[PDB]
Amino acid sequence: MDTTVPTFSLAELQQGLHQDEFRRCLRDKGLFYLTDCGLTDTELKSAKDLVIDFFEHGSEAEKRAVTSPVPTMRRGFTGLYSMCYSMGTADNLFPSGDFERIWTQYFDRQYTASRAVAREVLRATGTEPDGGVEAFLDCEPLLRFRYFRMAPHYDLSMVTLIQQTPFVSLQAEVGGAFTDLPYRPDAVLVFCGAIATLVTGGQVKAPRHHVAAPRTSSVFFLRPNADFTFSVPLARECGFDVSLDGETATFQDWIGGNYVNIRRTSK
Amino acid sequence: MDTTVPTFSLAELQQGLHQDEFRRCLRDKGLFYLTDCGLTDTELKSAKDLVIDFFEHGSEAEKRAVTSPVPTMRRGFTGLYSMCYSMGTADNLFPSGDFERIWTQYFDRQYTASRAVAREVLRATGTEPDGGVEAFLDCEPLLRFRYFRMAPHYDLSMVTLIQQTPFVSLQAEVGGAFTDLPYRPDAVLVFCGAIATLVTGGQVKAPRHHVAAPRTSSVFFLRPNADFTFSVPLARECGFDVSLDGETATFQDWIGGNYVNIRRTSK
Amino acid sequence: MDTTVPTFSLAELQQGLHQDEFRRCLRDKGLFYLTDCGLTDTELKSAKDLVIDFFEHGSEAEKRAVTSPVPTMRRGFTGLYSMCYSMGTADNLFPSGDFERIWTQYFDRQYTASRAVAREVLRATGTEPDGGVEAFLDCEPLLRFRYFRMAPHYDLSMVTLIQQTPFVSLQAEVGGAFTDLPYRPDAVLVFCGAIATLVTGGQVKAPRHHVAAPRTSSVFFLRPNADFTFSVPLARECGFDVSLDGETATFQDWIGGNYVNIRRTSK
Numbered sequence: 001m002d003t004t005v006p007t008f009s010l011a012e013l014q015q016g017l018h019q020d021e022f023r024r025c026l027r028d029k030g031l032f033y034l035t036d037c038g039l040t041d042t043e044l045k046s047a048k049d050l051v052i053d054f055f056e057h058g059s060e061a062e063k064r065a066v067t068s069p070v071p072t073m074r075r076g077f078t079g080l081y082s083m084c085y086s087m088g089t090a091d092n093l094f095p096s097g098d099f100e101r102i103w104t105q106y107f108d109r110q111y112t113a114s115r116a117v118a119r120e121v122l123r124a125t126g127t128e129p130d131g132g133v134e135a136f137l138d139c140e141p142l143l144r145f146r147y148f149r150m151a152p153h154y155d156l157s158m159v160t161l162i163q164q165t166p167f168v169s170l171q172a173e174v175g176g177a178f179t180d181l182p183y184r185p186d187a188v189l190v191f192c193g194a195i196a197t198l199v200t201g202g203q204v205k206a207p208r209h210h211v212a213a214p215r216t217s218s219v220f221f222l223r224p225n226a227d228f229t230f231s232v233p234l235a236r237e238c239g240f241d242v243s244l245d246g247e248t249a250t251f252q253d254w255i256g257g258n259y260v261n262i263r264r265t266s267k
Numbered sequence: 268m269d270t271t272v273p274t275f276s277l278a279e280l281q282q283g284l285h286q287d288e289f290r291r292c293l294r295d296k297g298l299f300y301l302t303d304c305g306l307t308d309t310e311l312k313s314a315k316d317l318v319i320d321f322f323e324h325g326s327e328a329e330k331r332a333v334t335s336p337v338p339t340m341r342r343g344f345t346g347l348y349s350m351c352y353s354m355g356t357a358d359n360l361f362p363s364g365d366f367e368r369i370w371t372q373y374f375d376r377q378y379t380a381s382r383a384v385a386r387e388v389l390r391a392t393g394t395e396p397d398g399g400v401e402a403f404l405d406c407e408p409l410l411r412f413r414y415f416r417m418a419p420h421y422d423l424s425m426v427t428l429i430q431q432t433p434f435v436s437l438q439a440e441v442g443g444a445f446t447d448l449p450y451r452p453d454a455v456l457v458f459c460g461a462i463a464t465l466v467t468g469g470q471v472k473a474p475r476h477h478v479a480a481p482r483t484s485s486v487f488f489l490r491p492n493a494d495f496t497f498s499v500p501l502a503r504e505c506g507f508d509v510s511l512d513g514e515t516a517t518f519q520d521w522i523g524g525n526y527v528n529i530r531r532t533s534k
Numbered sequence: 535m536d537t538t539v540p541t542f543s544l545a546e547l548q549q550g551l552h553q554d555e556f557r558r559c560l561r562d563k564g565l566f567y568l569t570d571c572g573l574t575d576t577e578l579k580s581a582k583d584l585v586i587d588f589f590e591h592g593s594e595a596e597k598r599a600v601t602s603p604v605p606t607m608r609r610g611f612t613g614l615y616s617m618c619y620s621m622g623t624a625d626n627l628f629p630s631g632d633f634e635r636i637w638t639q640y641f642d643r644q645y646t647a648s649r650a651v652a653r654e655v656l657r658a659t660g661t662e663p664d665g666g667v668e669a670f671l672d673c674e675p676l677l678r679f680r681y682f683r684m685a686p687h688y689d690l691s692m693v694t695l696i697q698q699t700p701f702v703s704l705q706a707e708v709g710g711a712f713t714d715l716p717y718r719p720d721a722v723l724v725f726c727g728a729i730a731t732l733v734t735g736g737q738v739k740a741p742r743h744h745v746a747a748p749r750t751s752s753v754f755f756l757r758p759n760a761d762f763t764f765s766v767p768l769a770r771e772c773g774f775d776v777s778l779d780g781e782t783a784t785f786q787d788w789i790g791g792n793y794v795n796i797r798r799t800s801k
């Protein structure tokens with residue numbers, strides 16, 4: 001195994017190409033850049049531009065009308081010496097007139113790409129989730145766009161898609177050492193998270209990553225439904241320090257009644 | 268909307284005065300000073316004085332006899348280069364002879380004021396909790412008195428009452444920026460917490476607050492019972508990033524088996 | 535009460551000696567060194583030596599083959615500018631050929647000593663766990679060996695056994711102040727954790743401890759099963775700030791679906 005973060009074309013994967021290379025990437029690294037998945041730089045511009053014009057020029061009242069009453073960063077605007085804009089499949093809060101269109105299309109592209117790669121991850125590992133593949137992937141995504149440092153953690157998602165604007169702050173553990181993860185023109189960076197490890201019975205690594213110290217980021221978490229069900233003994237076999245009585249459990253059983261998106265190894 | 272933290276008299280509120288002003292305060296700010304609620308400065312003195320005489324002059328054995336065996340800061344004394352004294356409605360640990368009297372009366376005054384303002388918050392928003400108003404308010408309060416810095420968080424209470432001794436360290440987000448919250452002679456500072464937002468279907472803001480860097484504080488958390496029940500879809504509509512299967516849930520379902528009093532927006 | 539961290543011989547305890555001294559130690563301090571429990575310095579050498587030879591000379595591929603796909607520090611190797619090696623009663627990941635033998639024997643010695651002292655703690659306090667003593671002690675231990683700072687916390691274990699290599703970084707609160715806890719040639723340091731307090735109805739202190747700033751440590755957590763059941767009102771009486779409806783609950787109910795090993799007093 002070398003220490004190169006690989007790149008895969010989603011379309012080539014969907015055509016059955018690079019099977020061994022993909023499978024070993026998932027087992028040994030758990031991250032990769034993904035091309036050919038409908039996330040062209042053009043589009044990040046349309047979405048980026050109008051959010052960035054809301055962030056700098058939205059009035060305090062305009063911001064307040066798209067702020068939730070609890071500051072959870074789940075939907076709408078959050079002031080944080082940074083600003084965030086969050087979305088999912090429903091219950092969104094949109095500025096204006098043309099923002100909704102642009103951002104619904106952007107979200108859709110990312111949700112589709114995310115489901116698609118996750119579908120390939122399942123296929124590559126021979127995994128049939130309890131309840132089937134499509135009910136598993138029809139889930140609880142969350143998109144956060146941040147505009148202007150992260151201690152090492154791993155994601156609790158199935159997969160996480162990250163688009164950025166281009167010093168390389170983002171690094172990940174590859175082969176036992178942190179490696180730069182720079183902006184890739186027509187690629188998105190995919191991190192496998194803990195739910196990939198869980199659902200596939202340990203066939204996918206969930207790598208640790210952080211942001212080092214010396215701008216904008218789009219992070220799409222593909223998160224399972226509360227009712228995603230898994231084998232308890234199987235979870236223990238792959239490193240999950242579960243406190244679950246009995247033989248099956250749900251995501252809700254494991255993580256509790258509020259989504260938790262990341263975890264540190266520390267305790 | 269201006270950036271002034273308002274003041275309301277509880278008695279005027281109870282008489283039906285300032286309805287619009289109160290309702291908009293709750294929706295747009297979620298904090299206010301409260302007068303005319305039975306929390307006169309005199310009384311904080313009686314209680315403050317004798318706890319402060321326990322903190323400086325209680326022996327190590329006297330302190331130990333009012334320390335719980337797990338250092339949870341729920342009841343009795345905690346050494347923390349600060350000291351804390353905690354109370355609720357039962358299972359208390361009291362020094363001496365006259366402390367119990369003074370502190371039971373002080374606690375009662377604060378629990379009554381807390382229930383009263385919460386009653387007004389419910390009324391102002393047209394909210395009938397599942398199970399009714401009075402069973403909701405007959406809850407699980409916790410009073411902590413601290414004697415001698417806080418990163419931004421919001422409270423998970425229904426309301427939080429804060430009395431202090433008088434540089435202004437306490438600040439809260441109002442209108443998108445942090446604002447000083449100084450000692451007010453015959454007033455208590457009320458923060459709405461996340462359970463206010465939850466129970467009222469999003470009609471009350473739970474503002475973020477912190478303690479900035481350059482003394483004593485009394486913080487009364489009005490916390491719901493474990494069995495407080497709410498609509499899951501409704502929770503999602505107001506920003507709660509819940510992982511709850513099905514249509515209703517309890518506080519225990521949401522937060523788990525141990526009270527959590529505060530939360531950071533971060534994850 | 536003096537501020538000396540006591541030492542007890544397990545064999546003397548098992549013979550009925552030092553009953554008062556032991557019981558008061560548990561109530562007032564909740565920590566002690568333990569001799570005569572089968573944890574001779576020789577043995578820590580055998581185990582220490584071969585893990586330390588894996589840590590410095592195991593290749594990246596050899597390390598990877600004993601690394602779990604989620605970096606939870608539950609089993610096998612973790613890189614962390616430190617390395618960890620973790621074990622329990624099953625699902626272990628072992629280097630080589632002779633490591634498994636050595637480390638299985640080492641783990642067994644520590645699990646036996648841990649159950650033995652816990653048995654004495656129960657006996658000294660007259661405690662019969664729900665379901666009986668031996669089903670309680672046939673539990674979910676976790677051993678972590680760390681090779682090269684800790685903010686104050688208390689353990690959520692029944693007991694924690696700590697062997698170290700010999701400035702004294704480890705300190706604990708005894709009598710209201712932090713006290714050095716140096717390496718003891720043929721002794722192990724025992725901290726009672728919160729489950730000792732819980733199961734005994736408050737008869738055992740769970741002391742706070744930390745690592746101060748100016749090497750290797752072996753920390754064995756004896757952790758209850760998910761189904762360990764306790765009285766809710768009784769828990770509240772001893773300081774546990776539980777949010778549990780009804781009269782009995784399990785460890786899983788209280789802490790959730792993932793083990794949590796430590797807690798800070800802070801919230």
Ligand SMILES: CC1(C)S[C@@H]2[C@H](NC(=O)Cc3ccccc3)C(=O)N2[C@H]1C(=O)O
Binds near residue numbers: 149155218262
């Ligand atoms: C958890 C994260 C949001 S942090 C990392 C990256 N974020 C940034 O690089 C922006 C940032 C700047 C300063 C501090 C934190 C994050 C980004 O996006 N990443 C997410 C992830 O790690 O899955």
Ligand SMILES: CC1(C)S[C@@H]2[C@H](NC(=O)Cc3ccccc3)C(=O)N2[C@H]1C(=O)O
Binds near residue numbers: 422436476484485
């Ligand atoms: C969570 C808090 C206990 S912190 C804040 C204030 N506390 C203080 O101002 C005293 C303090 C000094 C230094 C560090 C933390 C708190 C106080 O009381 N506040 C509580 C709240 O925010 O609801």
Ligand SMILES: CC1(C)S[C@@H]2[C@H](NC(=O)Cc3ccccc3)C(=O)N2[C@H]1C(=O)O
Binds near residue numbers: 267680684694
């Ligand atoms: C939680 C701990 C793992 S930390 C403490 C001691 N660990 C060390 O002394 C090594 C260390 C060095 C630097 C930072 C943290 C821990 C050790 O072992 N202790 C454990 C405990 O406290 O029950």
Ligand SMILES: [Fe+2]
Binds near residue numbers: 209
């Ligand atoms: Fe992440």
Ligand SMILES: [Fe+2]
Binds near residue numbers: 421476
């Ligand atoms: Fe607070």
Ligand SMILES: [Fe+2]
Binds near residue numbers: 688689694743796
């Ligand atoms: Fe510890």
